[PDB]
Amino acid sequence: NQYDNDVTVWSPQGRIHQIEYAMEAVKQGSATVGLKSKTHAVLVALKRAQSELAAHQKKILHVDNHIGISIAGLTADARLLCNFMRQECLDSRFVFDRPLPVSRLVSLIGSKTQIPTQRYGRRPYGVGLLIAGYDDMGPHIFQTCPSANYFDCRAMSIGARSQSARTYLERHMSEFMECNLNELVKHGLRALRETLPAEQDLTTKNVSIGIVGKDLEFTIYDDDDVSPFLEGLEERPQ
Amino acid sequence: TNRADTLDPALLRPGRLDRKIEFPLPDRRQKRLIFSTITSKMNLSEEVDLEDYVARPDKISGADINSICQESGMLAVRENRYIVLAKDFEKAYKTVIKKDEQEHEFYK
Amino acid sequence: FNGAQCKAVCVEAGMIALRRGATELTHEDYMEGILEVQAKKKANLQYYA
Amino acid sequence: YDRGVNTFSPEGRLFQVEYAIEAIKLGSTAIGIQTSEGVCLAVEKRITSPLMEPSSIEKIVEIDAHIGCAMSGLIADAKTLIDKARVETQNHWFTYNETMTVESVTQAVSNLALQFGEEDSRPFGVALLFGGVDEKGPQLFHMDPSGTFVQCDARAIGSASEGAQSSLQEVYHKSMTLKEAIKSSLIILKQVMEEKLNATNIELATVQPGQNFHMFTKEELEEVIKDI
Amino acid sequence: DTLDPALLRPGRLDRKIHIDLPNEQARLDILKIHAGPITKHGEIDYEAIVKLSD
Amino acid sequence: GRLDRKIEFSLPDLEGRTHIFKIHARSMSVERDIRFELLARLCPNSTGAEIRSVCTEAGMFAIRARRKIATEKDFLEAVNKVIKSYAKFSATPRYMTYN
Amino acid sequence: RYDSRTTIFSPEGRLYQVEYAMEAIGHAGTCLGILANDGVLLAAERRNIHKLLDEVFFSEKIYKLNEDMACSVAGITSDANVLTNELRLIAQRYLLQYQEPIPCEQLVTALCDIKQAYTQFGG
Amino acid sequence: SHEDPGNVSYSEIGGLSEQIRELREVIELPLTNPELFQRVGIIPPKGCLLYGP
Amino acid sequence: SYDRAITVFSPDGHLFQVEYAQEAVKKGSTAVGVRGRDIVVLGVEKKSVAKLQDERTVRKICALDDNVCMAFAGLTADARIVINRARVECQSHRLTVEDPVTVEYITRYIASLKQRYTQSNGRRPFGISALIVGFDFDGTPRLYQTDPSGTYHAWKANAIGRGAKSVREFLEKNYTDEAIETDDLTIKLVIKALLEVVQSGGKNIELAVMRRDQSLKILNPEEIEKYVAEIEKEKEENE
Amino acid sequence: SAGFDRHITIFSPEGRLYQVEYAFKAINQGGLTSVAVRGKDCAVIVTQKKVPDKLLDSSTVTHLFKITENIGCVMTGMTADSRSQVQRARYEAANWKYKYGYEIPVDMLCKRIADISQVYTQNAEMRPLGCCMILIGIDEEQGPQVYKCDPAGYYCGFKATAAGVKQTESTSFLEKKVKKKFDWTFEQTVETAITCLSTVLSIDFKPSEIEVGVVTVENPKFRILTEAEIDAHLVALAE
Amino acid sequence: GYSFSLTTFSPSGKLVQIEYALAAVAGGAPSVGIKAANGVVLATEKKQKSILYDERSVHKVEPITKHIGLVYSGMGPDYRVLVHRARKLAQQYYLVYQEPIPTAQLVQRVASVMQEYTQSGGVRPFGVSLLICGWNEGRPYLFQSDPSGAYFAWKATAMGKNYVNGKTFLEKRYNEDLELEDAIHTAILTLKESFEGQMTEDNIEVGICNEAGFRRLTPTEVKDYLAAIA
Amino acid sequence: LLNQLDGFDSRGDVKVIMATNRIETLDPALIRPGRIDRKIEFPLPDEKTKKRIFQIHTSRMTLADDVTLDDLIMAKDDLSGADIKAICTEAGLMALRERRMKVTNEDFKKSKENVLYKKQEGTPEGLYL
Amino acid sequence: ASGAEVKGVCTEAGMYALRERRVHVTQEDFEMAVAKVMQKDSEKNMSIK
Incomplete structure (x- = not known):
């Protein structure tokens, strides 16, 4: 275990444990769920607070007119990666005068996060990106990792106790592809209501939904265009 | 013994050193003497020259000349001859402290 | 779950059902033996937002 | 082991930031309360000597004509952040002819609350309470060393903040008034301080939308204390 | 290695002789020593056992 | 089937120390006008046995002056005695840098 | 215990390399100067008085630094060449700047600041 | 000392025939006859060490 | 942490080396300073002439x-x-x-x-x-x-340096609002502070004042001797 | 001894440093043998290949690296250090050709490579390139040359030259062979190289394992032999 | 287990990494150098390990200018580095002043370089002791340096294996007044005191310094002179 | 001693005081409460009381009063009172050694440099300064 | 040295007179004994200091 301190050191089993520790630091975030249809991509996260009186720490943040990330x-x-993301967006928005395809942006994200994972003197980035976007070929749902091994999916979920969410995504990933926005979003929160312990229920102020559409600009919602999204549910099967 | 870190607050002293004499080890010209005396215990055919390996920088401190003698003569006892070759010297220079060796010859 | 936690879950299903004075074990008490957090704790959590 | 800002934990986490969050707790207390009438704020000085001149100890400083502050723990990291915060709001007024709102102020501070890096310096040791009046009325804001900035309706910091939060959540609600919150704050203060409450211990800072200037009460605070 | 180089001088012990991890003929011969009391048949693929062992 | 429960406890939270303040306040000669939560803040890591030491030391100050009605200052200087002036000698404080 | 480098302080607080540089002074050649008006003198002890040297240097401890100043030396020898060259260069830069000889106290404080620049920094 | 069971001879072992013969020359000889050693006149050697995995 | 280096926090939230570099100040020579209303005064002890x-x-x-x-x-x-x-x-x-x-x-x-x-x-x-x-x-x-x-x-x-708590305790037990300065009570207050020094040998006292318009004035250790004499006279007048 | 655990490049007591004398057997992890011979107006390199695979190629296993059009070399030790050292040699020979207008003599090149290895040794925080290099070339007014460059930066150069794994034995055969004063009429050189490697390794093998690099004062270009003429020399020494 | 590395002093002693470099110098090949009345004689002891090596490739005695000789006792790979530095530095002096550099100024600047490498904290010192000499302004000189940056001035000295024994012979044998030939005679005597028994035209390698300039002798006259010189 | 001192055989009112110099060899089974309540160190005193202890140890002898004990008072940084005892008596012993009633300051030098083996409190430090 | 390396030099000069054959003990004999029991400590190119 005396080899288990820095990024530079290869292990005698070859698994650099700083990467594993950064993965475990990612595992202690909030739960969040992102999933796409053929025409609309929806990512839904969960808010928390420091105390009762305080407001909730936000997760869905804006990036660009067609790009939004979870975290x-x-x-x-x-x-830091938000400012770099906005910077690389407005860089290509300046130069090429086009919106960015998502894949080259996430390749730039991997190449950005490569350097703090190989040299000495920076830590790997504890980060939980869920990226939704629109190139010419429709919605994309990518995820990252602190090991910069970014994935493409059709529905992922990262954070605390997100595995029951993954089971729900397994048993509805065939059903996801056909539907329009409303029942898609309520499948997302029918993942989030299983990312929670059963003795409490998802309220208004703790949930957040961000939709980007093929004709719809990326927009975040909070409690008021979410009060329409929260009705249309039944109770859990107790 | 070999290591000298044990005394001289009291052995080798002003006043105590009356015959307490420091004793180092012998110079070149001594390996020739050990080669003369211990190989006179074996039979020495009549002509296998012996200064040909003092000129090698063997440095084989003065017991293991008899190790050369033992392994070499008894390797001739694998042929059961009492008469000595120069092949005894090669086989007792490739089965003795040929490890470190020889070289390093960098840095002087 | 290892076999340690096998034993832990079934004895916690006993004990959670032993709380309220039920007549026998109950499926939700098995589940709360499981929801004895899979023995994974805590967190504070602080900076994970 | 853990020794160093560039090594995680087997379970999390730093372990340098956590030791900073521990290093907050030793500081003096402060209490700020958001009310739609305006943001009030209070602090304890913990005066040691009679030679310790009370008006020289800074806790509430003035960032803008409507943006106040309070500090915690280490003094000089707070001095650094206050200096830069003053500079950047003036830059906002330069390029925009308007007032940098308090959320934008605290994002501008927590851009380098954690820009800590000794190569390619240490994390800061201060908790900050921010109050101000933007276009959305009054705002009360609370950050930390880790940059995890959040809005709080009535946040208490530093020493004895547990009972401060508990007895604060006892009395507080959303439709409070100003002076009621002021005396409710100094009640919590003289339950959490050690010395007798008088003219020199505490200092208030209240900002109103119609009273943007002078976020302070000077020895009418004596009249406020003697009303308890 | 960890033996003191005062003990590595000959005369005391004459030579350090090495026993190795076996070779193909060595594995085969010690295997046929171990292949003795066996109710085998005409099936013993000696070369596959020795070559597939390393 | 013999020793199977393993009841856990450790250092008390804060309110446990307030309860022990109640306990070793009621069983000796103090005054009933004082608080303890400030003293509970002054004991981040301590034991109820050391709360007994704190109460008997406020009693030592209550011996020093002829006090059977313990002030808040008696327990103030008692905690100041135990946790900062008898933790080892007196001089882990004596710098500002903080307040 | 709290040895490792010249920085940082010891737990009382003292310094490590300062005292150990002093104890590096203690085993060297002995110098002195005397109380005199209308003149001042220096004394010095010859290290390595062996018979097979040359003595062609006229000065092994004295260094006539500007015109009207010399200096003896004690300690580790070869650091002093770096110091004497730099000191001569400081006084000569002063003379270049003013065309007046250096009044010796700002010379002394200049060399003290040169030494103190390696007392503070690390490592 | 006398807990020692006698074994089979070197028919159980193999692939060390050089070690068998040479280590036999360094072990077995001077109690078979110590006087070929004294025919050449040399004192017999003393011991060896075995090593490896 | 450990007492190495300045960049690491303690496990309980301190910086060891700031507190430890304060110790060299805590074990140094004493120097006090007061303000009068028009003339300011300060001075050091421990001339320590060899x-x-x-x-x-x-x-x-x-x-x-x-x-x-x-x-x-x-x-x-x-x-x-x-x-x-x-x-x-x-x-x-x-x-x-x-x-x-x-x-x-x-x-x-x-x-x-x-x-x-x-x-x-x-x-x-x-x-x-x-x-x-x-x-x-x-x-x-x-x-x-x-x-x-x-x-x-x-x-x-x-009050700083060695035993500064005692010296500041004397300024605590003196420090009157009255009067005023009045550069005489301030001179006598400097005399009482230097008499309240850790040693107060009488010759290791070094004091310099400023009357807020002038420059620095280095005193002469005969005026201080008469100051010590009137302090001893007032100490006799206390009885 | 150590004690000091020899982790960085410092001086240990009595009196050596252990990093370079650990680098001297980074050659020995190569598992490879090289022999150079200078007798007369020619110069011969010989080095075998250890290819166990039929899926592996045979052209790109070549260790003879033609540095310039009149200078050849061979490498042993680990491969990456060797190839990087070879590109440094080519770059610095081209730098000679650019700066000074004519073809570099093989002495200055070995000096420059040794100096690069010494700078890699003098300053720490870089691995000391654990490979050994033997050079050959023809120079006017000096004939042919054979040189050796060490990982330490100790160049030398001499008549019969060998480095790798088993070259105490090779230099023993070359002391027992370069002692008789006969001339070396180029097939004497090829025969003695093949038979010295054939007595050190004792294999007596196909013409497809060794590589032969020659240079001669009749064609000063560096030249690598073909399977046919290698077979011709091998059966020409077959009696 | 201390000192380690180069940035911090010992509890009481000296710079252990410089003492170890001095020990590595003392563990090197022997040499001797003698300052006479008109010239300076340098002599080294250069044994090949095998009978294979050539004696025309590596050179111990090495000129710095046309009238300044220089030998060492240590490691050639560092020797060549600081030789090249001294070359470039002496040619820079001759650029500045258009005059051949005096030996004292050489020893000052070379000592400055070696001292700069003894500074902290990643580079090791040289394991090289020099013996610098030259004939500047009539009187010839002889300057020994060391890895510690220091320097001296000798009439006759030695460095290498048995330098103590060779020096005790130098104290007895040498004097103040000789010529270059008698200096070479006593130099090969004190080098032959400590070298191996077979000393030939190639095991030694000798350069001199007349006032007419530096001269590096050949194996012809070296074999003519040491053909049983006494 | 354990089973008798603060075991049974009811305590009541029996005062027992134990005293040491060091604490390392103490079994903590006796250091624990029940058996021993209060733990009381003693600081080697400040110079403000060194002046009185040096005065009183010199209160009953003849002494040339020009000499300044403030050298001795400031010098030894961790003096005990046995130090002061041996100094204030041994300086008079060095003076009355050659039958002098009053003591010279270099007899105080001889006294203190007898009393402390290698009186090493000057630099370090010495050079605050 | 600490007291009687005087006696060491005297004894080793008597030993030099013992190996040789003399009855007069000159000063050069004592100086050879000084070379015996006074050298090591020796060793220069180490003044530095």
Whole structure:
């Protein structure tokens, strides 16, 4: 275990444990769920608070007219990659005068997060990105990792106790592809209501939904265009 | 013994050193003497020259000349001859402290 | 769950059903043996937002 | 082990930031309360000597004509953040002819609350309470060393903040008034301080939308204390 | 290795002789020593056992 | 089937120490006008046995002056005695940098 | 215990390299100067008085630094060449700047600041 | 000392025939006859060490 | 953590080396300073004459401007660096702003330099604590103190160095609102402070004053002898 | 001994450093043998290949690296250090050709490579390139040359030259062989190289395992032999 | 287990990493150098390990200018580095002043370089002791340096294996007044005191310094002179 | 001692005081409460009381009063009172050794440098300063 | 040295007179004994200091 301190050191089993520790630091964020149809991509996160009186720490944040990210883990690295993300967006928006395809942006994200994972003197980024976007070929739902091994999916979920969410995504990923926005969003929160312990229920102020559409600009919602989204439910099967 | 870190607050002293004499080890010209005396215990055919390996920088401190003698003569006892070759010297220079060796010859 | 937690879950299903004075075990008490957090704790949590 | 800002934990986490969140707790207390009438704020000085001149200890400083502050724990990290915060709001007024709102102020501070890096310096040791009046009325804001910035309706910091939060959640609700919150704050203060409450211990800072200037009460605070 | 180099001088012990991890003929011969009391048949694929062992 | 429960406890939270303040306040000669939550803040890590030491030390100050009605200051200087002036000697404080 | 480098302080607080540089002074050649008006003198002890040297240097401890100043030396020898060259260069830069000889106290404080620049920094 | 069971001879072992013969020359000889050693006149050697995995 | 280095927090939330570099200040020579209402006064103890040298170069009280005065404790080399940079800074303030330099500005500079020196990579903190006394704005007397952390902290009287708690306890037990200055009660208060020194040998006393319009005045140890004589006379008059 | 655990490049007591004398057997992890011979107006390199695979190629296993059009070399030890050293040699020979206008002599190239290895040794925080290099070339007014460059930066150069794994034995055969004063008529050189490797390794193998690099004062270009003429020399020494 | 590394002093002693470099110098090949009345003689002891090596490739005696000789006792790979530095530095002096550099100024600047490598904290010192000489302004000189940055001035000295024994012979044998030939005679005597028994035209390698300039002798006259010189 | 001192055989009112110099060899089974309640160190005193202890140890002898004990008072940084005892008596012993009633300051030098083996409190430090 | 390396030099000069054959003990015999029991400590190119 005396080899288990820095990024540079290969282990005698070859698994650099700083990467594993950054993964475990990602595992202690909030739960969040992102999933797409053929025409609309929806990512839904969960808010928490420091106390009763205080407001809730937000997760869905805006990036660009067709790009929005979810997040889990650290917040300084979150805002760091946010500023880098907005910067690379407005860079290509300046130069090429087009919106960015999502895949080259996430390749730039991996190449950005490569350097703090190989040299000495920076930590791997504790980060929980769930990226929704629109290139010419429709919605994309990508996820990242602190090991920069970014994935493409059709529905993922990261954060605390997000595995029951994954089971729900397994048993409805065939059903996801056909539907319009409303029941899609309520499938997302029929993942979030299983990301919670059963003795409490998802209220208004703790949930957040961000829709980007093929003709719809990326928009965040909070409690008021979410009060329409929260009705249309039954109780859990007790 | 080999290591000298045990005394001289009291052995080798002003006043105590009356015959307490420091004793180092012998110079070149001594390996020739050990080669003369211990190989006179074996039979020495009549002509296998012996200064040909003092010129090698063997440095084989003065017991293991008899190790050369033992392994070499008894390797001739694998042939059961009492008469000595130069092949005894090669086989007792490739089965003795040929490890470190020889070289390093960098840095002087 | 290892077999340690096998034993832990079934004895916690006993004990959770032993709280309220039920007549026998109950499926939700098995589940709360399981929802004895899978023995994974705590968190504070602080900075994970 | 954990020794160093560039190594995680087997379970989380730093372990340098956590030791900073521990290092907050030793500081003096402060209590700020958001009310739609305006944001009030209070602090304890913990005066040691009679030679310790009370008006020289800074806790409430003035960032803008409607943006106040309070500090915690280490003094000089707070001095750094206050200096830069003053500079950047003036830059906002430069390029926009308007007032940088308090959320934008605290995002501008927590851009480098954690820009800590000694190569390619240490994390800061201060908790901050921010009050101000933007276009949305009054605002009360609370950040931390880790940059995890959140809005709070009535946040208490530093020493004895547990009972401060508990007895604060006892009395507080959403439709409070100003002076009721002021005396409710100094009641919590003289339950959590050690010395006798008088003219020199505490200091208030109240900002109103119609009273944006002078976020302070100067020895009418004596009249406020003697009304308890 | 950890033996003191005062003990590595000959005369005391004459030579350090090495026993190795076996070779193909060595594995085969010690295997056929171990292949003795066996109710086998005409099936013993010696070369596959020795070559597939390393 | 013999020793199967393993009841857990550790250092008390804060309110446990307020309860022990109640306990070792009621069983000796103090005054009933004082608070304890400030003293509970002054004991981040301590034991109820050391709360007994704190109460007997406020009693030692209540011996020093002829006090059977313990002030808040008696327990103030008792905690100041135990946790900062008898933790080892007196001089882990004596710098501002903080307030 | 709290040894490792010149920085940081010891737990009382003292310094490590300062005292150990003093104890590096203690085993060296002995110098002195005397109380005199209308003149001042220096004394010095010859290290390595062996018979097979040359003595062609006229000065092994004295260094006539500007015109009207010399200096003896004690301690580790080869650091002093770096110091004497730099000191001569400081006084000569002063003379270049003013065309007046250096009044010796700002010379002394200049060399003290040169030494103190390696007392503070690390490592 | 006398807990020692006698074994089978070197028919159980193999692939060390060089070690068998040479280590036999360094062990077995001077109690078979110590006087070929004294025919050449050399004192017999003393011991060896075995090593490896 | 451990007592190595300045960048790591403790497991309970402290910086060991700021507290540990305060110890060298806590074990140094004493120097006090009070303000009268029109004349300011301070001085150091422990002249510590070794019978065979000059002492005009070892002066622990200096000035940066015609309005402000210095003092320090701790080790003297860090005082030499800070004073050298402080003269430059006071003159650079004179370069832009055409005022006489306010004391609060130069103290903010000293504390800011000291703290940005302490934050950085492996730079040893300045183990001093200065006293910065001056009266500029309408002749208003001020005195501030420093710390290795970098906390300027305005007082009305002060005591540092060895046994500073006892010395400050005497200023505590003296410090009357009346009257006033009245430069005589202030002179006698300096005499009582130096009589309240850790040794008060009578010859190791070094004091310098400023009457808020003048420059620094170094006194003469015969006037101080008559001051000690009238202190002994008042001590006899107490009986 | 150590004790000091020899982790960085410092001086140990009595008196050596252990990093370079650990680098001297980074050659020995290569498992490879090289022999160079200078007798007369020719110069011969010989080095075998250890290819167990039929899926592996045979052209790109070549260790003979033609540095310039008149200078060849061979490498042993680990491969990455060897190839990087070879590109440094090519770059610096081209730098010679650019700066000085003519073809580099093989002495200055070995000096420059040794100096690069010494700078890699003098400054720490870089691995000391654990490979050994043997050079050959023809120079006017000096005939042919054979040189050796060490990982330490100790160049030398001499008549019969060998480095790798088993070259105490090779230099023993070359002392027992370069002692008779006969001339070396180029097939004497090829025969002695093949038979010295054939007595050190004792294999007596196909013409497809060794590589032969020659240079001669009749065609000063570096030249690598073909399977046919290698077979011709091998059966020409077959009696 | 201390000192380690180069940035911090011992509790009381000296710079252990410089003492170890001095020990590595003392563990090196022997040499001797003698300052006479008109010239300076340098002599080294250069044994090949095998009979294979050539004696025309590596050179111990090495000129710095046309009138300044220089030998060492240590490691050639560092020797060549600081030789090249001294070359470039002496040619820079001759650029500045258009005059051949004096030996004292050489020893000052070379000592400055070696001292700069003894500074902290990642580079090791040289394991090289020099013996610098030259004939500047009539009187010839002889300057020994060391890895610690220091320097001296000798009439005759030695460095390497048995330098103590060779020096005790130098104290007895040498004097103040000789010529270059008698200096070479006593130099090969004191080198032959400590070298191996077979000393030939190639095991030694000798350069001199007349006032007419530096001269590096050949194996022809070296074999002519040491053909049983006494 | 354990089973008798603060075991049974009811305590009541029996005062027992134990005293040491060091605490390392103490079994903590006796250090624990029940058996021993209060833990009381003693600081080696400040110079403000060193002046009185040096005065009173010198209160009953003849002494040339020009000499300044403040050298001795400031010098030894961790003096006990046995130090002061041996100094204030041994200086008079060095003076009355050659039958002098009053003591010279270099007899105080001889006294203190007898009393402490290698009186090493000057630099370090010495050079605060 | 600490007291009687005087006696060491005297004894080893008597030993030099013992190996040789003399009855007069000159000063050069004592100086050879000084070379015996005074060298090591020796060793220069180490003044530095």
